[PDB]
CSV table of C-alpha atoms and ligand atoms in Angstrom, one decimal:
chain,number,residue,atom,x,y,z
D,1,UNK,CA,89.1,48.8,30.5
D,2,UNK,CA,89.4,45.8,32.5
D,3,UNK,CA,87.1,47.9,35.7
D,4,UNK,CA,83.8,45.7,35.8
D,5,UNK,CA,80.9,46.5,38.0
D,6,UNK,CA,80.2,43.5,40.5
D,7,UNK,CA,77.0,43.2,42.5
D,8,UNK,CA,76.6,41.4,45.6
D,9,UNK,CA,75.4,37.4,45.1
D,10,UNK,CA,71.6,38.3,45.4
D,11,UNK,CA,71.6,41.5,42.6
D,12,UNK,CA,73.4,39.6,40.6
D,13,UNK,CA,71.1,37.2,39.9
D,14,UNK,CA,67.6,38.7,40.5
D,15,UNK,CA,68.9,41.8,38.3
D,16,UNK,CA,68.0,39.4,35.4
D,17,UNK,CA,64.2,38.9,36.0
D,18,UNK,CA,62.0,41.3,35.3
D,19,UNK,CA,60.1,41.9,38.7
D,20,UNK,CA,63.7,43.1,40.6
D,21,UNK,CA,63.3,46.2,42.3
D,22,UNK,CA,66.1,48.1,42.6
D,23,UNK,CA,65.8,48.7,46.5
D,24,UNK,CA,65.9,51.8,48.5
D,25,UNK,CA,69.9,52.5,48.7
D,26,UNK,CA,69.8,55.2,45.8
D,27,UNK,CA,73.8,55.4,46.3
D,28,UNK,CA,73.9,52.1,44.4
D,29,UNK,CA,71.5,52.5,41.6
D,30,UNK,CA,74.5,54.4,39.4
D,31,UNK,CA,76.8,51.0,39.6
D,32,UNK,CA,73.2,49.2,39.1
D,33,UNK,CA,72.8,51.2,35.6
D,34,UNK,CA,76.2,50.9,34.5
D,35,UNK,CA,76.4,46.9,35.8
D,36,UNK,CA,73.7,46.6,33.1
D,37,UNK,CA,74.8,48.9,30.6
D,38,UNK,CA,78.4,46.5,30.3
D,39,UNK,CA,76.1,43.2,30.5
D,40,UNK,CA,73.8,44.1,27.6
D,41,UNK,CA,76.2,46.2,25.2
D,42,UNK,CA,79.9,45.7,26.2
D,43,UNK,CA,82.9,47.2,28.5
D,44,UNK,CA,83.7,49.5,26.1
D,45,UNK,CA,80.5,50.7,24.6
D,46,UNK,CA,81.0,54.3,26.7
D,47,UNK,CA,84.2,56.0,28.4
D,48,UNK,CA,83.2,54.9,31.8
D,49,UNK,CA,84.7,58.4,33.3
D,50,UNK,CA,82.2,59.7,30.8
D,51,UNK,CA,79.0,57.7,31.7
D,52,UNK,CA,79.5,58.2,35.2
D,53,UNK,CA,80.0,62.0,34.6
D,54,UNK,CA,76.8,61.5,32.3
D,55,UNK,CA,74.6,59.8,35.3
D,56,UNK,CA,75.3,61.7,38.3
D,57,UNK,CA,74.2,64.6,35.9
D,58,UNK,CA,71.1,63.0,35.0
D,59,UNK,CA,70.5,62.4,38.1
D,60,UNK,CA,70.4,66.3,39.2
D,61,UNK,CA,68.1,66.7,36.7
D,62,UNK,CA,65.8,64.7,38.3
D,63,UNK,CA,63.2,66.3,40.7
D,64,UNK,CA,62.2,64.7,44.9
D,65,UNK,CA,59.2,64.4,43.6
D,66,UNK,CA,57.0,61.3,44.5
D,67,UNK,CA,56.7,58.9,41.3
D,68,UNK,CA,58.9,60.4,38.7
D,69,UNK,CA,62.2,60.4,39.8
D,70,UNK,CA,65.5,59.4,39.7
D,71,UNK,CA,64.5,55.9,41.3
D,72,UNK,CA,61.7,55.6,38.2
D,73,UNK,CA,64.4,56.4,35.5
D,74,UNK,CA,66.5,53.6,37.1
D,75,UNK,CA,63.5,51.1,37.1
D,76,UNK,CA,62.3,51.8,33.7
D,77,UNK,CA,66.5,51.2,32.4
D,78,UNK,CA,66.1,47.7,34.3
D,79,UNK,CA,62.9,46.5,32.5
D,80,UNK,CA,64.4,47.9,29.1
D,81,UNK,CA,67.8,46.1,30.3
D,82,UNK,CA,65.8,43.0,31.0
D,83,UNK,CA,63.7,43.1,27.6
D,84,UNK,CA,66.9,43.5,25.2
D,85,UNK,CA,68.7,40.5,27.5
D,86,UNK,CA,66.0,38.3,27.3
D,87,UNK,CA,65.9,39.1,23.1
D,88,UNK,CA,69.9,39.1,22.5
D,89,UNK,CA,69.8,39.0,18.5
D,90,UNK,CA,66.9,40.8,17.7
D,91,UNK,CA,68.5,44.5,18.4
D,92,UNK,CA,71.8,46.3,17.0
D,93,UNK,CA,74.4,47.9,19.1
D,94,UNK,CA,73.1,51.3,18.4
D,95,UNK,CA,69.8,50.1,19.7
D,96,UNK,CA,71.0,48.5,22.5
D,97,UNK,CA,72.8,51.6,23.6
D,98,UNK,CA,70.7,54.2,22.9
D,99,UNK,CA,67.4,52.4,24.6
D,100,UNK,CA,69.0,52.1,28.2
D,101,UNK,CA,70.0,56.2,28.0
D,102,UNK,CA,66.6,56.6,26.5
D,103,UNK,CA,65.0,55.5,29.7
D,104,UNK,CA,67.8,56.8,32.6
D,105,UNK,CA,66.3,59.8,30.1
D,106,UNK,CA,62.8,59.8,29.8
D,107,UNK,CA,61.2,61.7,32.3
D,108,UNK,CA,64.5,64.3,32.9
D,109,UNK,CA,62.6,67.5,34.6
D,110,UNK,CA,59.6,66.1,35.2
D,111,UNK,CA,57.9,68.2,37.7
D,112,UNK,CA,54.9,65.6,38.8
D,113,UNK,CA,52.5,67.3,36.6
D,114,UNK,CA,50.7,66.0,33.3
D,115,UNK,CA,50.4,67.6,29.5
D,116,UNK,CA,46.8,67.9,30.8
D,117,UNK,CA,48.0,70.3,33.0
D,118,UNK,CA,50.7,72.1,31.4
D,119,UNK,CA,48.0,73.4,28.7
D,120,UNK,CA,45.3,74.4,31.7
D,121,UNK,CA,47.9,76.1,33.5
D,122,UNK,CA,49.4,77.7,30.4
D,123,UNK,CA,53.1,76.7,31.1
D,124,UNK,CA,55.6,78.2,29.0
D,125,UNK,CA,56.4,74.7,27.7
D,126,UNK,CA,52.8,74.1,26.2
D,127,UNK,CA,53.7,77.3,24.3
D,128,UNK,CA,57.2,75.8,23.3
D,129,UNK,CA,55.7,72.3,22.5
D,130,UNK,CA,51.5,71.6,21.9
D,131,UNK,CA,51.7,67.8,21.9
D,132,UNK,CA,53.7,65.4,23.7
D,133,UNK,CA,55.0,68.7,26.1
D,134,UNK,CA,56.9,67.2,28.5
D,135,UNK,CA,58.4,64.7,26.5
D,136,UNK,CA,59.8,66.7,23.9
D,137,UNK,CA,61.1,68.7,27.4
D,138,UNK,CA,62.4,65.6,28.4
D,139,UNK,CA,64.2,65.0,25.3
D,140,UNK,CA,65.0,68.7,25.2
D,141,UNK,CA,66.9,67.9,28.8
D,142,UNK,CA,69.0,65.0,27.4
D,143,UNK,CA,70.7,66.5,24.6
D,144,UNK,CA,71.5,69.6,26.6
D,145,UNK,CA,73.0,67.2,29.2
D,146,UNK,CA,75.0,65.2,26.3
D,147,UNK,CA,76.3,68.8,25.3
D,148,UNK,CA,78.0,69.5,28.7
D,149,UNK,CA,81.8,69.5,28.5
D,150,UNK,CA,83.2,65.4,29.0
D,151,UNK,CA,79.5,64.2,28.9
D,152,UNK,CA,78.9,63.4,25.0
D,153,UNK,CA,78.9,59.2,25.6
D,154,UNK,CA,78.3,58.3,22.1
D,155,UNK,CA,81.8,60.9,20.7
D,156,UNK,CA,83.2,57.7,19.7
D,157,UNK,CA,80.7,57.0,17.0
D,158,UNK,CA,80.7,58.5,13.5
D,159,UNK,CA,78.8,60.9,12.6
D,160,UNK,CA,76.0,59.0,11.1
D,161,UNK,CA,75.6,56.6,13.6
D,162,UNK,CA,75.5,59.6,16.2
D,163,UNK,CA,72.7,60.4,14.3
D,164,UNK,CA,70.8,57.3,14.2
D,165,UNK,CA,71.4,56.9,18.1
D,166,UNK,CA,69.7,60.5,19.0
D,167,UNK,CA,67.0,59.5,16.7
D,168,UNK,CA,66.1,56.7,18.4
D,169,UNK,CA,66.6,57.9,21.9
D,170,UNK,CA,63.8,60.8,20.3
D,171,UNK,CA,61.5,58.5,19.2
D,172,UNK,CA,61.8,56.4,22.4
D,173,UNK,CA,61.5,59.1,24.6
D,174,UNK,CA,58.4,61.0,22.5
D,175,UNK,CA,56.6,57.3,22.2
D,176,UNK,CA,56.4,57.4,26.6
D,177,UNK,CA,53.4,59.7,25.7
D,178,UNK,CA,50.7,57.4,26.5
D,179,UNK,CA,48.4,59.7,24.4
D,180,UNK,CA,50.6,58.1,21.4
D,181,UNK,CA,50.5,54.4,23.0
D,182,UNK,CA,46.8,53.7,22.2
D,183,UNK,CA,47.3,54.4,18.3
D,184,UNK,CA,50.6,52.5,18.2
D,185,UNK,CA,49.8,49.1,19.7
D,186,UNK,CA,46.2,48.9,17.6
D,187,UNK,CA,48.6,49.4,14.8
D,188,UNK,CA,51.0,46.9,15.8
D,189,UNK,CA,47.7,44.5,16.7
D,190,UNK,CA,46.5,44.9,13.2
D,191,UNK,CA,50.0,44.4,11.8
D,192,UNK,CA,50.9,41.1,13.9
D,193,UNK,CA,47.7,40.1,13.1
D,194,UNK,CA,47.1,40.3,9.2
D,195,UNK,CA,51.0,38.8,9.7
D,196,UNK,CA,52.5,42.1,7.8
D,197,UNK,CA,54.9,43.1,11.2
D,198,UNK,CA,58.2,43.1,9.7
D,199,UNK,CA,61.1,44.4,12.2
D,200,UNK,CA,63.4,44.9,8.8
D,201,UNK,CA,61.2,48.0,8.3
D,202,UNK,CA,61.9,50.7,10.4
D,203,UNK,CA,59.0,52.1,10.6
D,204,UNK,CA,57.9,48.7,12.1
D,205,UNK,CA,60.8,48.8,14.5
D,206,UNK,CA,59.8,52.0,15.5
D,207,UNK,CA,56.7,51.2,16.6
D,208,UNK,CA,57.8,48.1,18.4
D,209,UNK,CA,60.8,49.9,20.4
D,210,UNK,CA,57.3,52.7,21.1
D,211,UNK,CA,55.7,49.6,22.6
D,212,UNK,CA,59.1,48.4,24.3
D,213,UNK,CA,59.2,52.0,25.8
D,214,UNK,CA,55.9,52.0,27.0
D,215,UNK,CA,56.0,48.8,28.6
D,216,UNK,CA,59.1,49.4,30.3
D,217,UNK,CA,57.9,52.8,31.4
D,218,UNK,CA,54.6,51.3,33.1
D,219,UNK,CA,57.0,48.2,34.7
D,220,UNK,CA,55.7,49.0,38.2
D,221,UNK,CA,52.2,47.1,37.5
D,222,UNK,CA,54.4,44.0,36.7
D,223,UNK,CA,56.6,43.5,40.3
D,224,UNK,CA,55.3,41.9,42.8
D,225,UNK,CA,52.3,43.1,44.9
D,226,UNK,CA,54.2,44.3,47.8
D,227,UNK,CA,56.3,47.0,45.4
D,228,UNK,CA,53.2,47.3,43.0
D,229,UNK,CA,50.6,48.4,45.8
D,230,UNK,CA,53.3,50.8,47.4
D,231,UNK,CA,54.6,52.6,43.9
D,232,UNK,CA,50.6,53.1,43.3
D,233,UNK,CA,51.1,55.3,46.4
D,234,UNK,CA,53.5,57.4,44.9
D,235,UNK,CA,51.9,58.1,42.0
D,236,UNK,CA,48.4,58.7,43.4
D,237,UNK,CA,50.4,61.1,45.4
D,238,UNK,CA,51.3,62.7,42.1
D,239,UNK,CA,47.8,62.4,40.6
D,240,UNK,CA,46.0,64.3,43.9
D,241,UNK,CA,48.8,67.5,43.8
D,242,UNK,CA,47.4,67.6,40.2
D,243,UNK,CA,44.3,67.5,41.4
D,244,UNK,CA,44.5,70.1,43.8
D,245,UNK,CA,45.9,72.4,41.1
D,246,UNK,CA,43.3,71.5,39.1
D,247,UNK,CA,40.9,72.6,41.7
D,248,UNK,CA,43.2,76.2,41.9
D,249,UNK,CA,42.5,76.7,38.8
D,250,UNK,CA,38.7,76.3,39.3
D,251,UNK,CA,38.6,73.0,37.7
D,252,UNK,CA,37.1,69.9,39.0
D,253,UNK,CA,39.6,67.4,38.1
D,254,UNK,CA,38.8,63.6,37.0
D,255,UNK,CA,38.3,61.2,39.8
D,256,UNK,CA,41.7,59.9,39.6
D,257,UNK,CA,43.2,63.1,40.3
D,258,UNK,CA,40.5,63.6,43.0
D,259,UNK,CA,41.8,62.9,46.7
D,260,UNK,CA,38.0,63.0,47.7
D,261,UNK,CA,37.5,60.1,46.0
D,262,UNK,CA,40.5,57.8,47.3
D,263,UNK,CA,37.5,54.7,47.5
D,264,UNK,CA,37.3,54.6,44.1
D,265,UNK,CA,41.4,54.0,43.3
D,266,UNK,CA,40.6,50.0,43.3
D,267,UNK,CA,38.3,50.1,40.5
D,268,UNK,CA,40.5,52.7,38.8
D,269,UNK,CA,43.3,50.3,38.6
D,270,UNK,CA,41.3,47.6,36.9
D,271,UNK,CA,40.6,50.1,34.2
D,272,UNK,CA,43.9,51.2,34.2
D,273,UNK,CA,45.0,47.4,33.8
D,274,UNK,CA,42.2,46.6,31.7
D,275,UNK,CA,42.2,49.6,29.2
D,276,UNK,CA,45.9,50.2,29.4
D,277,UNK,CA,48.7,47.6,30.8
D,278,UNK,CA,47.1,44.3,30.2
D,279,UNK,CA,46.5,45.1,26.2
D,280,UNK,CA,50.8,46.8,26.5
D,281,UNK,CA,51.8,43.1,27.8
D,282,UNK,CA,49.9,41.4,25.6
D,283,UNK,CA,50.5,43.0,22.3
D,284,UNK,CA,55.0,43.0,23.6
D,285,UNK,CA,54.4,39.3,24.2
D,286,UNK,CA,52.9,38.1,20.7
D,287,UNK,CA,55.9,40.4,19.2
D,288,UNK,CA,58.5,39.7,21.9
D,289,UNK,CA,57.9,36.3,23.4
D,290,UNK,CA,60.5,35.7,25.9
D,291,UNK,CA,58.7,39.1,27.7
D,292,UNK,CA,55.6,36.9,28.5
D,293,UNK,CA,56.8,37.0,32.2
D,294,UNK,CA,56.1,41.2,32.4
D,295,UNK,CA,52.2,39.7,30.8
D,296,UNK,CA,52.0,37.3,33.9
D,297,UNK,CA,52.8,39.7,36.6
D,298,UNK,CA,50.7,41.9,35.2
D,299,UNK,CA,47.4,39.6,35.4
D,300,UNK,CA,49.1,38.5,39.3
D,301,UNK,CA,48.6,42.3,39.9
D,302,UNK,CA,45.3,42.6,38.8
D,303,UNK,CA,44.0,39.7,40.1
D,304,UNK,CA,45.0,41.5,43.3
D,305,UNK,CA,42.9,44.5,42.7
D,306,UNK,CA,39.8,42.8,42.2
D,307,UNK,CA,40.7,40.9,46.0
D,308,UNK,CA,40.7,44.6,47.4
D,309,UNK,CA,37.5,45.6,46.1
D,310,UNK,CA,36.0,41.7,47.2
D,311,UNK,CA,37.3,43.3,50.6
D,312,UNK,CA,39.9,40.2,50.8
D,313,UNK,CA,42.6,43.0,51.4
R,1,LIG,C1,44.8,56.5,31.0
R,1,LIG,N1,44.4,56.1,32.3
R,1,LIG,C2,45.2,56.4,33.4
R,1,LIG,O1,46.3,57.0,33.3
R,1,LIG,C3,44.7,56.1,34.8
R,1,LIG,C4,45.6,55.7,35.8
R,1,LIG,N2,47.0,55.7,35.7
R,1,LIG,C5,47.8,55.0,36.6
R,1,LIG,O2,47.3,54.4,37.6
R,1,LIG,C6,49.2,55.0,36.2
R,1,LIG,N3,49.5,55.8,35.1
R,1,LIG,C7,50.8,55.9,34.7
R,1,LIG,C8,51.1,56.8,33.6
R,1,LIG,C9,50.1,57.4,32.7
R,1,LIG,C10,50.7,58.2,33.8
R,1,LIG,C11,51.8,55.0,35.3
R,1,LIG,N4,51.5,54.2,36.3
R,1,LIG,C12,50.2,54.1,36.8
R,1,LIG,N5,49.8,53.3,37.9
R,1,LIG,C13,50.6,52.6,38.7
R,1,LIG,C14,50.1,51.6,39.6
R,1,LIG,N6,50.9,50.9,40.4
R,1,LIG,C15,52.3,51.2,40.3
R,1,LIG,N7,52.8,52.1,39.5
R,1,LIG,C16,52.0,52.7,38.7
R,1,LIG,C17,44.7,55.4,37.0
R,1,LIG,N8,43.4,55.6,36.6
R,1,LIG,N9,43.4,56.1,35.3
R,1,LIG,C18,42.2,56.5,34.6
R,2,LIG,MG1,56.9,60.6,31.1
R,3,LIG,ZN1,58.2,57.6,33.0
């Protein structure tokens, strides 16, 4: 009861902006998810011999694979934690807990491989689930993993509040589609807009905590350059395996997934930041305005692509 998580002097403070990177000493990103958990819902929100049985198995459920791992989950917790500290009153407690296991959650099992390529492959899964595959997988994962003997977190809840909690860790985890994110923020654009966004409405809130989960789950564009420029490594990484596949299939795969055409990564990322991040910032911002500083890094990152491609780095 009375156990709190301590970090030394320099987490402890940069833990609460929302370019920290966690660092490379995986062995302390547990005590990292739990330090946040306690700061942004309470001491007694979980049995802490519970959550810690409930992250290390997370954590095995994670694969060594080069962008979406264990690390990634981690990150995506710390942007989510950073968003609902930086917005105190605006959230319940159910929300508050079930949005930081939503994103230690949200990519459980991923294998490195897209929907795109589940269907062209004709992976069981695509058979189990036709839209959204891996995220309905990843969902799939987390209630299994909540099933396990001494893992079940949230057994101190009543029943209906159990229920809201594993509905919104399903919509938070099926919204980090990005198929999905592209109808949900011109939706929330329109709404915020023509001023009918109302977060009393849960249908509104749901769409808000989509936009929350996107944002959180594309947070590498919005560190600094040094960690932005060396994550885009790992996920190219990712993207070229696909690609490869792709070509095992006897299938030319887009020219992101295309390690041919490395040169042409630069100008992919401004149309990634362009058609993709940039509008994700901007939209959480006008909702959310104390995440304006996610917007701003964003831009800093750009603006650093476009140097590359003027051959300034
Ligand atoms: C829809 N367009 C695209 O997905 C797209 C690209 N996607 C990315 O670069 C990228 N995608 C994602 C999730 C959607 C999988 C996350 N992070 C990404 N980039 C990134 C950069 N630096 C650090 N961390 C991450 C690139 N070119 N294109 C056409
Ligand atoms: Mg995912
Ligand atoms: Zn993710």
């Amino acid at each position: 009861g009375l156990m709190q998580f301590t970090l030394p002097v320099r987490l402890c403070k940069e833990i609460e902006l929302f370019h920290f990177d966690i660092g490379p000493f995986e062995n302390m990103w547990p005590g990292i998810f739990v330090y946040m958990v306690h700061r942004s819902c309470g001491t007694s929100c979980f049995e802490l011999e519970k959550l810690c049985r409930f992250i290390m198995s997370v954590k095995k459920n994670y694969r060594r694979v080069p962008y979406h791992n264990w690390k990634h989950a981690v990150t995506v917790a710390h942007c989510m934690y950073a968003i609902l500290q930086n917005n105190h009153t605006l959230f319940t407690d159910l929300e508050r807990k079930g949005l930081l296991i939503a994103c230690l959650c949200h990519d459980l099992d991923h294998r490195g491989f897209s929907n795109s390529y589940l269907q062209k492959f004709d992976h069981p899964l695509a058979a189990l689930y036709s839209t959204s595959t891996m995220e309905q997988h990843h969902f799939s994962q987390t209630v299994s993993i909540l099933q396990l003997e001494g893992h079940n977190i949230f057994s101190t809840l009543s029943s209906s509040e159990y229920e809201q909690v594993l509905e919104i860790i399903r919509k938070a985890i099926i919204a980090t589609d990005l198929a999905l994110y592209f109808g949900n923020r011109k939706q929330l654009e329109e709404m915020y807009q023509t001023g009918s966004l109302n977060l009393n409405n849960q249908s509104h809130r749901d769409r808000v905590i989509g936009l929350m989960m996107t944002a959180c789950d594309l947070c590498s564009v919005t560190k600094l350059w040094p960690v932005t420029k060396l994550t885009a490594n790992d996920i190219y990484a990712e993207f070229w395996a696909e690609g490869d596949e792709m070509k095992k299939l006897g299938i030319q795969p887009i020219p992101m997934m295309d390690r041919d055409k490395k040169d042409e990564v630069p100008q992919g990322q401004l149309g990634f930041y362009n058609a993709v991040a940039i509008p994700c910032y901007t939209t959480l911002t006008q909702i959310l305005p104390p995440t304006e500083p996610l917007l701003k890094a964003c831009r800093d990152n750009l603006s650093q692509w476009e140097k590359v491609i003027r051959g300034e780095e």
